[PDB]
Write an enzyme that holds these catalytic residues in place. Structure first.
Site, PDB file in Angstrom:
ATOM      1  N   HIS A 144       0.808  -1.216   0.000  1.00 40.51           N
ATOM      2  CA  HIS A 144       0.000   0.000   0.000  1.00 40.51           C
ATOM      3  C   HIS A 144       0.842   1.266   0.000  1.00 40.51           C
ATOM      4  O   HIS A 144       0.263   2.362  -0.039  1.00 40.51           O
ATOM      5  CB  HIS A 144      -1.017   0.092   1.163  1.00 40.51           C
ATOM      6  CG  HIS A 144      -0.439   0.207   2.548  1.00 40.51           C
ATOM      7  ND1 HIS A 144      -0.244  -0.871   3.388  1.00 40.51           N
ATOM      8  CD2 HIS A 144       0.033   1.290   3.217  1.00 40.51           C
ATOM      9  CE1 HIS A 144       0.259  -0.447   4.540  1.00 40.51           C
ATOM     10  NE2 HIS A 144       0.453   0.857   4.454  1.00 40.51           N
ATOM     11  N   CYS A 178       4.166   1.344   9.351  1.00 42.37           N
ATOM     12  CA  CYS A 178       4.012   0.259   8.397  1.00 42.37           C
ATOM     13  C   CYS A 178       5.368  -0.191   7.875  1.00 42.37           C
ATOM     14  O   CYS A 178       6.286   0.613   7.727  1.00 42.37           O
ATOM     15  CB  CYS A 178       3.111   0.711   7.255  1.00 42.37           C
ATOM     16  SG  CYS A 178       1.456   0.887   7.900  1.00 42.37           S
ATOM     17  N   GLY A 201       3.065   5.762  10.037  1.00 41.67           N
ATOM     18  CA  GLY A 201       4.457   5.672   9.656  1.00 41.67           C
ATOM     19  C   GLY A 201       5.144   4.391  10.077  1.00 41.67           C
ATOM     20  O   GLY A 201       6.262   4.135   9.628  1.00 41.67           O
TER      21      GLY A 201
END
Lengths: 306, 306
Positions: free
Chosen positions: A41, A145, A143
């Site tokens: 993503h 991820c 942030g």
């Protein structure tokens, strides 16, 4: 003695964290040999998130759209591919800090350490369990991820989790390192929700053995129970069923403490039925279920790594 | 969101751990530049431990009596000296992995990460507090002496603890990195015992703010209290006195949550007086006191290091 939620030493994984930027999205990647692994993503736009077609979004990308930074040193992307929900960016430089590693997809109830990162830099390390409903009760902000979860076995890092998203209850969802989500979740920013969670019974029992090893015995009793009768009580309390294989896993702890597995089940039964009456076990006023039998043995025998 | 006991990333400290052997005693040392720091009781014999004279024992030593191993690579000792209760072994090789570092002596209530080690190899990392009675509730087995506790501030490791001994209650005693014990303890294997411990009030309040930041609000109320009246209740529950300086430290958290410090004190007062009534806060059924205000801010704002 003493018993803590102990994470694996994080140095081997710190040497792999990088920052991946695509558009206005910045997150973390895992740099192993000449590949950087990150959530797909990252290629999403703040308006593509409701129902993205990642195959389209990705074919529209060029290598130079991916800004990969390892410290200050920038990494040239020479190729990219999608594997399930992870993006694999081939870079022109092999990470010289690459540890011996594997990718493993863990079962619910298994524990792992999380190295929480922002902008490719570690913030901290903590221990987690894969919940039976395939969420993790993490500590993750925007942030984070691409932060990973892992175990270490002597010299080998087994990566088992990469962080993707936070569910409305404040718990977290992610994939293995080959991009397959744990649980039914999808990387779409639509309503999903975790299923009902349950307590990891085999882990509670392991932690009760940890308590005995450490000198807490107040919860023991002279009773025993059959596995059948134990699971009747456990079901009533949304505990996971105890299997014979769980009993077998608890064998080493049972032998070290001299408390038959099924006897410890009778102690847990009375703890479920009467509560703890203002008492604590290993500094907790709840029954702790994020230590596996293996975690207890490692911590109580002093297993090291390198 | 979410809130965990989060340790600092341990890689910078892992690169410093070595093994120190003297006689039949093996423990861990901290290798920084060309010096290895370890507990001076490494020079003790299994019969010197009742009341050793370390000045005598040390003058009887030669450099070659100290076996220092960094991985498989053995380190030549070229000199040795005693500083309080730490031994400083000068070696002929500067550790190339030496991080930016300081030695700091912390106050009670401050937290730190412990990298537990055996035979110079890390076993795991966990978060701790210096208790008001100057013990730490660690997880340490025989062979863990010389393991260190530390904080990280951007790029700099502040070492604050080195492990020496376990007290009869299963808690742990040690020194700063210049060899001064925390608390009244001495490196003599005679009866000593921790003083009565108390709860770190300023940290409980910080953790209550962590809970609010994360959406637990059930424990709030419309009451307030004066600092005087709060400390009357805290004293009754062996909580540490709250100072005006504590209140000031809690300012950033108070401003972020919109809950006056003294109002959060009134919530804690009611929690002390009524208990939690089967409710949990941040997954705990006890009031947690091993997060400082600073720990809460770091974890809830995503501060990183490198």
């Amino acid at each position: 003695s003493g018993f803590r939620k102990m994470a694996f030493p994080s140095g081997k994984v710190e040497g792999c964290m990088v920052q991946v930027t695509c558009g206005t999205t910045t997150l973390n990647g895992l740099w192993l040999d000449d590949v950087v692994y990150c959530p797909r993503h990252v290629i999403c736009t703040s308006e593509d998130m409701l129902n993205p077609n990642y195959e389209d979004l990705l074919i529209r990308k060029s290598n130079h759209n991916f800004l990969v930074q390892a410290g200050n040193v920038q990494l040239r992307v020479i190729g990219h591919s999608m594997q399930n929900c992870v993006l694999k960016l081939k870079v022109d430089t092999a990470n010289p800090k690459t540890p011996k590693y594997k990718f493993v997809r863990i079962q619910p109830g298994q524990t792992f350490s999380v190295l929480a990162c922002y902008n490719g830099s570690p913030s901290g390390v903590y221990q987690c369990a894969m919940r039976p409903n395939f969420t993790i009760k993490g500590s993750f902000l925007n942030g984070s991820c691409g932060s990973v979860g892992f175990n270490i076995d002597y010299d080998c890092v087994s990566f088992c989790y990469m962080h993707h998203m936070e569910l409305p209850t404040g718990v977290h969802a992610g994939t293995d390192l080959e991009g397959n989500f744990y649980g039914p979740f999808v990387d779409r920013q639509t309503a999903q929700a975790a299923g009902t969670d349950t307590t990891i019974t085999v882990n509670v029992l392991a932690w009760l053995y940890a308590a005995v090893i450490n000198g807490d015995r107040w919860f023991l009793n002279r009773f025993t129970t059959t596995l059948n009768d134990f699971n009747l009580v456990a079901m009533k309390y949304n505990y996971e069923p105890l299997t014979q294989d769980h009993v077998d896993i608890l064998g080493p702890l049972s032998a070290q403490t001299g408390i038959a597995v099924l006897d410890m089940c009778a102690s847990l039964k009375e703890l479920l039925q009467n509560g703890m009456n203002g008492r604590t076990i290993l500094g907790s006023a709840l029954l702790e279920d994020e230590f596996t039998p293996f975690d207890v043995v490692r911590q109580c025998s002093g297993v090291t790594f390198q």
